[PDB]
Amino acid sequence: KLSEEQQHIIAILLDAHHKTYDPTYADFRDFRPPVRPLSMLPHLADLVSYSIQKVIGFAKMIPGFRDLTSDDQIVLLKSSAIEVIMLRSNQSFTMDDMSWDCGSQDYKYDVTDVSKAGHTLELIEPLIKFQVGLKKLNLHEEEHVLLMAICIVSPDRPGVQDAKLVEAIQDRLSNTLQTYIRCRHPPPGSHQLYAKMIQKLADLRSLNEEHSKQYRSLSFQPENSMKLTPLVLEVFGN
Amino acid sequence: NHPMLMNLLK
Ligand SMILES: [C]C1=C(O[C][C][C]C([O])=O)[C]=[C]C(C2345B678B9%10%11B6%12%13B96%14B%109%15B%1172B932B437B%126(B%13835)C%14%1527C2=[C][C]=C(C([O])(C(F)(F)F)C(F)(F)F)[C]=[C]2)=[C]1
Numbered sequence: 001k002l003s004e005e006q007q008h009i010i011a012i013l014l015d016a017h018h019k020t021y022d023p024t025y026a027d028f029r030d031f032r033p034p035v036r037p038l039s040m041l042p043h044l045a046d047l048v049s050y051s052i053q054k055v056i057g058f059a060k061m062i063p064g065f066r067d068l069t070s071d072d073q074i075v076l077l078k079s080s081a082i083e084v085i086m087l088r089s090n091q092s093f094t095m096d097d098m099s100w101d102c103g104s105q106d107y108k109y110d111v112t113d114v115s116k117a118g119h120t121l122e123l124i125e126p127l128i129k130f131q132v133g134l135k136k137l138n139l140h141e142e143e144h145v146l147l148m149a150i151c152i153v154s155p156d157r158p159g160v161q162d163a164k165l166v167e168a169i170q171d172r173l174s175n176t177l178q179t180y181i182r183c184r185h186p187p188p189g190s191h192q193l194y195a196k197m198i199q200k201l202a203d204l205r206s207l208n209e210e211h212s213k214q215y216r217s218l219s220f221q222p223e224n225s226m227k228l229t230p231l232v233l234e235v236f237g238n
Numbered sequence: 239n240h241p242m243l244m245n246l247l248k
Pocket residue numbers: 021022025041044045047048049051054085086088089092100102109114117118119215218228232236
């Protein structure tokens with residue numbers, strides 16, 4: 001039985017996502033232009049920096065997130081940012097040509113664009129496999145926003161101080177998701193869906209680790225760091 | 239330390 005509180009949580013997270021995800025991609029006009037030599041790094045750095053801002057806006061609305069300390073909020077957002085950005089991007093991902101389609105040919109990104117921002121197949125191949133496996137789950141929007149929120153509020157992130165409180169907040173979201181699947185996701189799509197969604201969170205930890213490796217090699221070169229944004233430098237490191 | 243993160247969180 002989906003309790004009234006659990007329905008409330010889902011409503012909050014759906015609204016938070018709708019307030020922090022613009023499916024018209026209007027703000028892409030503001031980014032440095034894509035050029036198709038790490039020719040896509042300025043554009044995709046701007047895209048990521050933009051997405052970081054939106055992920056923070058979503059995080060602030062997760063029930064219980066505001067009850068954490070400032071330090072724990074920062075630690076969770078720093079460690080989860082690239083994972084939530086990858087999850088968030090799955091909305092625009094299409095399996096029809098394995099690309100992130102953001103409304104325009106100019107704003108349609110394939111594996112070549114990603115390598116033109118400085119990343120390598122060590123990241124890109126598992127990243128495509130993730131996007132495909134996530135897309136095949138055909139998540140309800142309710143489950144998509146719950147998974148983003150569970151990803152953010154993870155008690156085993158490095159540098160978490162109040163792990164017991166983070167865990168208490170995550171457990172409320174996890175039980176909401178488990179009960180939503182049981183009561184609202186019909187079979188056969190519901191089959192071991194919770195375990196499959198948690199497996200995706202495990203995949204994101206591995207993607208996070210490889211992204212940070214490649215980011216460090218990328219940003220170690222000052223010529224590359226010059227093309228990043230100040231927010232990206234603060235979040236992913238200097 | 240994290241002034242832009244902290245400002246976007248307020
Ligand atoms: C959320 C979102 C999105 O969403 C819909 C449209 C936006 C919206 O409306 O939200 C669409 C597309 C992306 C993606 B997909 B995956 B591919 B890879 B990850 B995800 B972002 B960017 B490329 B595209 C990617 C990326 C680029 C740059 C780096 C860097 O490592 C660097 F630039 F290469 F250095 C960085 F430093 F991190 F930027 C890391 C990751 C993210």
